[PDB]
């Protein structure tokens, strides 16, 4: 059996942290993998924005149209963290800019917007549900989505099905290989991983990503493809939690935890 050949000290990190940490890295071409308290829930937080993109893909290849259609808001849509759709809000953005803006900046009026879109917290949790991710949940618009409330099942998933949908969606036959692609560079375009789990990954091997960061009980996280060079990719993710509210959280801790996912794995970085 291939789970864990290597042990790593995840259980010091995350007693350092303070918290605990979610692991889950697969190795695509072996089929070996890291696995650290990797089906328990942690908070979504932001990173369901990343499947949210992908959902939106998924539409777009029944409705030729809908990427290049143009979606016009106001005022009231631009809650706190809109970067990009803030800059638009005279003119409009295209379904396509809006989904690129909540993978690559978090955009919380992009994210929304394109929620409404899909149906709501169950329209994504059924697209989850399609791809065969039986344990995904959203069930909250923002803001409250983000409150990570110890023991509150909402709005979480775990370390393991946030991989194994990842690996479908970007490398697996979930999408039409344009909009694959398409996936693929949106997270290749991420601007906010670079403490995370980019800061364990060489320089000179491709990467996406997708991040999140509740705020509050010490709770982030990140999922990747790393494409090394001259072997497979690698699928991975990293949740953190913690047990008080005012308890912080560590974008250190992310990229250590994963640097321990590829040692796990013998990936030479």
């Not at 924005?49 to 106001?74: E, M, W």
Request: glycine share 10%; net charge neutral.
């Amino acid at each position: 059996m291939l789970t864990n050949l290597v042990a790593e000290p995840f259980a010091k990190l995350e007693q350092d942290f303070g918290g605990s940490i979610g692991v889950y890295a697969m190795d695509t071409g072996s089929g070996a993998t890291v696995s650290y308290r990797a089906e328990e829930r942690f908070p979504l937080c932001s990173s369901f924005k990343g499947f949210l993109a992908a959902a939106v893909l998924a539409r777009s290849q029944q409705q030729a149209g809908l990427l290049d259609t143009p979606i016009r808001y106001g005022k009231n849509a631009l809650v706190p963290w809109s970067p990009i759709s803030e800059k638009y809000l005279t003119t409009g953005m295209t379904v396509a800019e809006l989904s690129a803006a909540a993978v690559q900046y978090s955009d919380n009026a992009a994210a929304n917007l394109l929620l409404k879109e899909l149906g709501g917290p169950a329209g994504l949790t059924a697209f989850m549900r399609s791809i065969g991710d039986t344990t995904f949940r959203l069930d909250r618009w923002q803001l409250e989505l983000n409150s990570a409330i110890p023991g509150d099942a909402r709005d979480t998933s775990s370390p393991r099905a946030v991989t194994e949908s990842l690996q479908k969606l970007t490398l697996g036959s979930a999408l039409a290989a344009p909009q694959r692609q398409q996936f693929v560079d949106w997270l290749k375009g991420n601007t906010t991983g670079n403490h995370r789990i980019r800061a364990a990954v060489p320089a000179d091997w491709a990467v996406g990503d997708k991040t999140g960061t509740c705020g509050v009980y010490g709770t982030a996280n990140d999922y990747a493809v790393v494409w090394p060079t001259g072997r497979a990719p690698i699928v991975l993710a990293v949740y953190t939690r913690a047990p008080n509210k005012d308890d912080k959280h560590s974008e250190a801790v992310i990229a250590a935890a994963a640097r321990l996912a590829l040692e796990g794995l013998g990936v030479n970085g």
